[PDB]
Design a binder for this molecule. Structure first.
Ligand code: I3P
Length: 87
């Protein structure tokens, strides 16, 4: 909502670098992950067991509707966490 965005911003800067998402991107993606009912809180990102219903949906709306405005953010925020929960 304001802090979590920074907790993941500094994280993706070590697992992605300059390619990492911005503060304005994640912030927008979050609001969408809360409106779609896919998430109840911004801390839900700490649940690697919910990335399934959150990855298929985003990839479903993008492939269908024809827009991955939120996917580009999810994939990035995920590519980092996925590595943080592997070590
Ligand atoms: O310090 P970090 O961990 O590198 O995170 C950056 C920080 O939040 C900056 O204030 C922000 O500039 P804005 O508040 O103007 O968005 C930038 O977005 P940006 O890369 O699009 O400039 C973020 O990436």
């Amino acid at each position: 909502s304001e802090a979590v965005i920074k907790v993941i911003s500094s994280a993706c800067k070590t697992y992605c670098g300059k390619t990492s998402p911005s503060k304005k991107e994640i912030g927008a993606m979050l609001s969408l992950l809360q409106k779609e009912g896919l998430l109840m809180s911004p801390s839900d990102l700490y649940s690697p067991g919910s990335w399934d219903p959150i990855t298929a949906a985003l990839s479903q709306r993008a492939m269908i509707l024809g827009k991955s405005g939120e996917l580009k953010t999810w994939g990035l925020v995920l590519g980092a966490l996925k590595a943080a929960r592997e070590e």
